[PDB]
């Protein structure tokens, strides 16, 4: 019985921004902040603020110079200047996909979730939206084959961190049989050159992944893919 | 799943009051830090990452 | 009695092996058992570095509980000495440096005993998926430098070595 | 030369004596409370938690406990699914070829210096320029 | 002189080797 062997790579991009909080989690965080403030003893800023507030009231009846330079340097004017600087400084836009709503192929598509790469290939007998697979002679290792595939097929300088040498998933189909071994890899930094190429490469999350992948062999990738 | 171990407080008895300051490093990204002196924002500077030639170039540009 | 059939019914010292009445000596001798297939390597240090002490402690507790749940032999769960960096920002118009703030970074290290390749992959996936914000994660082998990092310097020993050389 | 040799011998003896000493760790400042916190405790006023706040806090605690239990259950189900997929893949590898199974059951040397950082609250801003500033360490020895 | 026990011993079920992987109870209750 002839056997065909293929590796395959599942590249996960780390989420850049933290996910938003459930309202239950927001309530819990507010409760934790309140109880932490209650159990706290005192802060230097608050102690100085209350001391200055009492000292001003005492001086309004006893005109005597207790502190000259440090009157508004604690809170008051200083707090207002802090707030002014915070308002003047502007942070980055966390929604870099809602403004676009067009490109599903951008590496900067989603920042809260993890994305995987899907490549479109139309073979002579099959038109498959296929995960990036490989081919190797029996003299090669699966992990080295995956490294060679990510170095060659991706056509870019990309740093992939492999989690473990052991395979992550195995899937077989018999016509003579064939086997595909999916290994998970993590993206560290990729400089994808020629982003306008005709090679349909799409960064895709779990839901759109289930939407795209039709066949049953590729429909079980979510079995070992983290749902997050 | 990044919000798993985020909702916690100081489990100690004696401690000063901390505030959720926004710290921005030399990358353009910000994080939340429990820190006294409730300044609304803190910035990480840099004057040692590069060598003498790049330091002189930066000084000339500034 | 020795001749009675019920001999050794009170035998209990074989059920517990914790009989080390030593002051503080540590073993620190588990070499990585790498046999090709059952790659049961040595002790591993998981370092969590964070400016937020509460967040660092929370994630250390979470990873320790996860290790306990996953039947992982946790050798230790300790804290490295804190590092307090001082921010000296250049004032406007240049030629000045003023104190901005102080940041105290804290490191919590979990020392685990043994692990396999597949379970290590799964554990790393879980850890990096559940990583909080602004926390640096490191996974290293327990070396002499890591063991001595907690200990303080030896100025007298260094001076004696310098005099010898 | 006799005096020099005696000095070297005494240096070696001092080396032995100092190596026979203890290797106590550095005290951790987090676990020890500084003296500056002893004066601010008496000035802290009580909070007088009311009945409605206590009841809503109890409700929130119960909801949080249930949510944490469900989150732990779903995470354990997910790791169980991942482990069963891993063991199925390993068994298929063992059935197919033993050499690849043996080559994969070992850990690569590249995983020893595993470094990793978590997410951030704000995505990085392109062409961001920190103005200036120098770092120094004030950590005590 | 040794004699054979007249039945199963109480603590002969648990394995002596590898005590660290065997779960213990930490409660006097």
Separation in Å, CA of E4 to nearest CA in chain C = 6
Structural domain containing residue A223:
1-19+114-228
- Rounded CA-CA distance D69/D75 in Å is 10
Which residues 2-21 of C are in CB contact (within 8 Å) with D? none
Chain D neighbors (3+ CB pairs < 8 Å): A, B, C
By what technique were these coordinates determined?
A: cryo-EM
- Rounded CA-CA distance C155/A25 in Å is 50
Residue C86's alpha-carbon distances to B45, C101, D59, in angstroms, are 11, 6, 43
- Reported resolution, Å: 3.9
- Of all residues in chain D, the one with the smallest CA distance to A169 is D89
Question: Nearest-5° angle of CA A212, CA A214, CA A220?
Answer: 95
- Rounded CA-CA distance C57/B9 in Å is 9
Which residues 90-109 of D are in CB contact (within 8 Å) with B? none
A–C interface: beta-carbon pairs under 8 A? 22
- Rounded CA-CA distance A43/A39 in Å is 12
Tokens of D119: 């997410």
Separation in Å, CA of B55 to nearest CA in chain D = 11
- Rounded CA-CA distance C61/C67 in Å is 10
H/E element holding B50?
A: none
The number of C-alpha atoms within 13 Å of D122 and in the hemisphere containing its C-beta is: 18
- End-to-end Cα distance, chain B: 43
Question: Nearest-5° angle of CA A67, CA A72, CA A76?
Answer: 145
Tokens of C134: 């602004």
Domains and CATH numbers, chain D: 26-124 (6.10.250.3440)
Neighbours of B8 (CB within 10 A): 20
CB C162 within 8 A of CB D15: no
Asked if A81 is an interface residue toward chain B (Cβ–Cβ < 8 A), one would say no
Asked if D89 is an interface residue toward chain A (Cβ–Cβ < 8 A), one would say yes
Separation in Å, CA of C98 to nearest CA in chain A = 16
Q: Which parts of chain B fold into alpha helices (H)? A: 52-61
Closest-CA residue to A219 (of A153, A149, A129): A129
Asked if C33 is an interface residue toward chain D (Cβ–Cβ < 8 A), one would say no
Q: Is the dihedral of CA D133, D135, D138, D139 positive or negative?
A: positive
- Of all residues in chain A, the one with the smallest CA distance to D44 is A41
* Angle at which helices C155-164 and D2-19 cross, to 10°: 150
H/E element holding D56?
A: helix D51-96
CB A142 within 8 A of CB A179: no
Separation in Å, CA of A103 to nearest CA in chain B = 23
Q: In a mutagenesis test of the B interface, which of C58, C62, C131, C137 is the best target, namely the one with the most B β-carbons within 10 Å?
A: C58
CB C151 within 8 A of CB D25: yes
- Rounded CA-CA distance C109/C139 in Å is 10
For the domain that residue A127 is a member of, what is the CATH number? 3.90.79.10
CB B21 within 8 A of CB B33: yes
**Which residues fall within 8 angstroms of residue C132, CB to CB, at 6 or more apart?**
B2, B3, B4, B5, B6, C50, C55, C58, C59, D118
Tell me the DSSP string of chain A.
--EEEEEEEEEEBPPSBPPPPPHHHHHHHHHHHHHHHHH----HHHHHHHHHHHHHHHHTTS---S-SS-SSSSSTHHHHHHHHHHHHS-PPPS-TTTTT-S-SS-TTS-SSS-BEEEEEEE-SS-EEEE--B----TTS-HHHHHHHHHHHTT-SEEEEEE--SS-SEEEEEE--EEEEEEEEEEEEEEE---TTSSS-EEEE-HHHHHHH--SHHHHTHHHHS---
Neighbours of C105 (CB within 10 A): 17
- Rounded CA-CA distance A7/A140 in Å is 11
CB D40 within 8 A of CB A47: yes
**Residues D133, B15: C-beta atoms closer than 8 Å:** no
Return phi, psi of residue C143, to 5°: -115, 175
Closest-CA residue to C57 (of D112, D58, A28, B15): B15
Share in percent of chain E as helix, strand, coil (round to 5): 0, 0, 100
Cβ-nearest to B2 among A19, A28, A39: A19
Residue C56's alpha-carbon distances to B29, B34, C47, C80, D123, in angstroms, are 19, 11, 10, 12, 22
Separation in Å, CA of C5 to nearest CA in chain E = 5
Q: In a mutagenesis test of the B interface, which of C88, C134, C136 is the best target, namely the one with the most B β-carbons within 10 Å?
A: C134
Give the 3-state DSSP-derived string for chain C, with helices as H, strands as E and coil as C. Answer: CCCCCCCCCCCCCCCCCCCCCCCCCCCCCCCCECCCCCCECCCEEEEEEECCHHHHHHHHHHHHHHHHHCCCCEEEEEEEEEEEEEEEECCCCCCCCEEEEEEEEEEEEEEECCCCHHHHHHHHHHHHHCCCCCEEEEEEECCHHHHHHHECCCHHHHHHHHHHC
**Residues D123, A94: C-beta atoms closer than 8 Å:** yes
Residue D35's alpha-carbon distances to B14, B53, C38, C128, D32, in angstroms, are 11, 47, 53, 38, 9
CB E11 within 8 A of CB E19: no
**Residues D11, C160: C-beta atoms closer than 8 Å:** yes
Tokens of A72: 């508004």
Separation in Å, CA of C5 to nearest CA in chain A = 52
- Rounded CA-CA distance D101/A166 in Å is 8
Domains and CATH numbers, chain B: 1-45 (6.20.130.20)
Cβ-nearest to C132 among B6, B18, B23: B6
Closest-CA residue to A189 (of A156, A167, A214, A211): A156
- Rounded CA-CA distance C81/C108 in Å is 9
Closest-CA residue to D79 (of A225, A202, C117): A225
Contact: chain A with chain C (3+ CB pairs below 8 Å)? yes
Q: Name C46's bridge partners.
A: C110, C139
CB A104 within 8 A of CB A202: yes
Neighbours of A133 (CB within 10 A): 19
List of chain E residues whose C-beta atoms are within 8 Å of the C-beta of residue C70: none
- Rounded CA-CA distance D81/C126 in Å is 13
Tokens of A221: 């990738």
Tokens of C52: 């937020």
Closest-CA residue to A166 (of C116, C113, D95, D80): C116
**Residues D136, C131: C-beta atoms closer than 8 Å:** no
């Amino acid at each position: 019985s002839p056997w065909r062997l293929l590796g395959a790579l599942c590249l996960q991009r780390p989420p850049l921004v933290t996910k938003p909080l459930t309202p239950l989690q927001e309530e819990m965080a507010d409760l934790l902040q309140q109880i932490e403030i209650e159990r706290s003893l005192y802060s230097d800023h608050e102690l100085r603020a209350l001391d200055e507030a009492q000292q001003l009231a005492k001086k309004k009846s006893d005109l005597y110079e207790e502190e000259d330079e440090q009157n508004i340097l604690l809170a008051q004017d200083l707090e207002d200047m802090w707030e002014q600087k915070f308002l003047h400084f502007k942070l980055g836009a966390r929604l870099t996909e809602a403004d676009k709503k067009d490109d599903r192929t951008s590496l900067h598509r989603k920042l809260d979730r993890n994305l995987i790469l899907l490549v479109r290939e139309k073979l002579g007998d099959q038109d498959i939206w296929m995960l990036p697979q490989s081919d190797w002679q029996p003299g090669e290792t699966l992990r080295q084959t995956a490294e060679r595939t990510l170095a060659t097929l991706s056509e870019n300088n990309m740093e992939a961190k492999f989690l473990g040498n052991a395979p992550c998933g195995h899937y077989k189909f018999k016509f003579l049989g064939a086997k595909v071994f999916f290994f998970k890899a993590l993206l560290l930094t990729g400089d994808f050159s020629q982003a306008g190429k005709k090679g349909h490469h799409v960064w895709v999350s779990k839901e759109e992944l289930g939407d795209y992948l039709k066949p049953k062999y590729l429909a079980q990738v979510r079995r070992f893919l983290l749902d997050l | 799943d990044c919000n798993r171990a985020l909702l916690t407080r100081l489990h100690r008895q004696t401690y000063a009051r901390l505030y959720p300051v926004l710290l921005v490093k030399q990358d353009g990204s910000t994080i939340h830090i429990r820190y006294r002196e409730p300044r609304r924002m803190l910035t990480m500077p840099v004057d040692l990452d590069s060598l003498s030639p790049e330091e002189r170039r930066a000084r000339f540009r500034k | 009695y020795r001749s009675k059939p019920t001999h050794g019914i009170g035998r209990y010292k074989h059920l517990v092996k914790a009989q080390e009445p030593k002051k503080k000596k540590g073993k620190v001798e588990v070499r990585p058992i790498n046999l090709g297939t059952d790659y049961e390597y040595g002790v591993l240090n998981i370092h969590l570095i964070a400016y937020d002490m509460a967040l660092a402690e929370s994630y250390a507790q979470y990873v320790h509980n996860l290790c306990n749940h996953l039947a992982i032999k946790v050798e230790e769960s300790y804290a490295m000495p804190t590092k307090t960096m001082e921010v000296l920002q250049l004032q406007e118009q240049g030629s000045k440096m003023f104190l901005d703030a102080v940041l105290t970074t804290h490191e919590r290290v979990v020392q685990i005993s043994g692990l396999s390749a597949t379970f290590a992959e799964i554990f790393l996936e879980i850890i990096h998926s559940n990583l909080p914000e602004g926390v640096k994660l490191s996974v290293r082998e327990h070396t002499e430098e890591d063991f001595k990092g907690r200990f303080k310097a030896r100025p007298e020993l260094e001076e004696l070595l310098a005099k010898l050389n | 030369p006799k005096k020099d040799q005696a000095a070297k011998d005494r240096l070696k003896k001092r080396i032995r004596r100092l190596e026979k000493a203890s290797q106590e760790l550095i005290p951790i400042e987090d676990f020890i409370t500084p003296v500056k916190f002893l004066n601010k405790e008496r000035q802290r006023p009580p909070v007088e938690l009311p009945f409605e706040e206590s009841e809503r806090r109890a409700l929130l605690l119960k909801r949080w406990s249930l949510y944490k239990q469900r989150e732990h259950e779903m995470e354990r189900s997910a790791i169980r699914s991942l482990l069963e997929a891993q063991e199925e893949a390993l068994q298929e590898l063992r059935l197919s070829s033993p050499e690849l199974h043996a080559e994969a059951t070992k850990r690569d040397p590249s995983l020893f210096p595993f470094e990793r950082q978590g997410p951030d609250y704000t995505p990085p801003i392109s062409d961001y320029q920190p103005p200036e500033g120098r770092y120094q360490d004030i950590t005590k020895v | 002189r040794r004699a054979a026990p007249l039945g199963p011993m109480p603590n002969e079920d648990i394995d002596v080797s590898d005590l660290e992987r065997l779960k213990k109870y930490r409660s006097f209750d």
